[PDB]
Amino acid sequence: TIPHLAIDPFSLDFFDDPYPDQQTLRDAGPVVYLDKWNVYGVARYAEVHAVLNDPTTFCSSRGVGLSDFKKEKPWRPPSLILEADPPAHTRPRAVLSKVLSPATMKTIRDGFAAAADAKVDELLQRGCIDAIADLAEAYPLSVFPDAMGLKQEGREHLLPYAGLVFNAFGPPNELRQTAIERSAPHQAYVNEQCQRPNLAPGGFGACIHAFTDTGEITPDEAPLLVRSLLSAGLDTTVNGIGAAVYCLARFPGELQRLRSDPTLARNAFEEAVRFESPVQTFFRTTTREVELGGAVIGEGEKVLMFLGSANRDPRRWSDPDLYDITRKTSGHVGFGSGVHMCVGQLVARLEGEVMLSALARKVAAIDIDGPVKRRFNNTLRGLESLPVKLTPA
């Protein structure tokens, strides 16, 4: 009934070009079994959406990586939000929602936009740049650690720590075990910055700690919630912005549309998130026997969702493999869906928007002018190096 496939979605060959294998996964059936890792897989939009939106049956408290916390010890203490289910999830979620609220975006937008404009001006002086190190990495590094309230010293630990976190959702392959063995100094730095005294006034970190007064979280919960933002808040946006620039570089017609109407910047970024899907995959664990897509899955089984695949499923999208900055993007699952849907999505969109706005207003052309190199991660899709020439408007 359920087809079995030998495809390894965490292999380097798969990362290098996942799209043919993703079609194979979609077309095999609504539910497949991945013999390589003994997990169920869903790669169509319909089933990915269904799983995300039934948190009771498809839980997160047994981990959203391959590892089942009921069987193995988590590599770090569980996240109070990502790796929790309702009701435990609900109050910590509400706190991060308020910390990263619509109202909060007003306090940081001017600074984020200024830094984006400044970066693009700086890059135009050089002309030929690496759109990863010099833009996709440099810009979020120039605004997010400050918005968190982090000191300057030690920030070089942030991207390695995030790479570790997202590799750790994967199976115990080489990527994962190498990350974990190098992890000690990054964990030590991050855990220390989570303490209240080390987070500057007015920043996201201080604001989380300030909520420990209200009855929503206790003081001992605040450091792990800061840890969530230091885990999920930087490397994701690096790959999202990298994705957007890569799309504009490959699809010059869309850059030209963006230049002609810079107010398309926000949707151009959203479409980039759909099109590349910086977060490719993660898991749920079944809490009961369940019927999904006409198949029966037993209790305590890992289910691997292919978010990137769902975002290219022709059953849901017209011309899924085209980058279209005026596409109706609502419903894409690049930020997830349901109760765990990215709590930081307003920050992500703000960064993406103001950077694409800067490019739209200041840059006439983006031409790849060197070898493109991919960055491999069990969960994240993105580039290591993207040599481009920027032509000023």
Residues annotated as binding site for heme b?
89, 93, 284, 340, 342
- Which run of H or E residues covers position 306? strand 302-306
CA angle 161, 164, 166 (to 5 degrees): 115
Q: Which stretch binds ligand EJD (CB under 6 A): 11-19, 188-196, 227-235, 240-248?
A: 227-235
165 binds, among ligand HEM, ligand EJD, Cl ion, none (CB under 5 to 8 A by kind): ligand EJD
Nearer to ligand HEM, 5 or 356 (CB): 356
Q: Residue holding tokens 């408007």? A: 393
Nearer to Cl ion, 168 or 255 (CB): 168
The binder of ligand HEM chosen from 45, 112, 251, 335 (CB under 6 A): 335
Residues 94-153 that bind ligand HEM (CB under 6 A): 96, 100
63 binds, among Cl ion, ligand EJD, ligand HEM, none (CB under 5 to 8 A by kind): none
Nearer to ligand HEM, 85 or 389 (CB): 85
Question: Contact between 232 and ligand HEM (CB under 6 A)?
Answer: yes
Give phi and psi for 197, each to the nearest 5: -60, -20
For the CA atoms of 159, 164, 167, 171, the dihedral, rounded to the nearest 10 degrees, stands at 180
The binder of ligand HEM chosen from 31, 42, 82, 208 (CB under 6 A): 82
Question: Contact between 309 and ligand EJD (CB under 6 A)?
Answer: no
The binder of ligand HEM chosen from 63, 145, 171, 344 (CB under 6 A): 344
340 binds, among ligand EJD, ligand HEM, Cl ion, none (CB under 5 to 8 A by kind): ligand HEM
Q: Which stretch binds ligand HEM (CB under 6 A): 65-73, 210-218, 277-285, 319-327?
A: 277-285
Cα end-to-end span (Å), the chain: 57
Q: What is the DSSP letter of 23?
A: H
Quick count: other Cβ atoms within 10 Å of Cβ 126? Answer: 11
Residues 73-92 that bind ligand EJD (CB under 6 A): 79, 81-82
Nearer to ligand EJD, 79 or 286 (CB): 79
Residues 6+ apart with CB under 8 A from 103: none
CA distances from 130 to 103, 253, 367, 384 (A): 34, 22, 11, 9
CA distances from 267 to 311, 326, 330 (A): 15, 7, 10
Distance CA 53, CA 57 (A): 9
Closest alpha carbon to 139 in 153, 154, 118: 118
Q: Which residue pairs from 183-187 have beta carbons closer than 8 angstroms and sit at least 24 positions apart in sequence?
A: 183/75, 185/157, 186/157, 186/160, 186/161, 187/76, 187/161
Question: Contact between 211 and ligand HEM (CB under 6 A)?
Answer: no
The binder of ligand HEM chosen from 32, 48, 348, 358 (CB under 6 A): 348
C-beta nearest to ligand HEM: residue = 344
Q: Which residues bind ligand HEM (CB under 6 A)?
A: 60, 64, 81-82, 93, 96, 100, 228-229, 232-233, 236-237, 240, 273, 278-279, 282, 334-336, 340, 342-344, 347-348
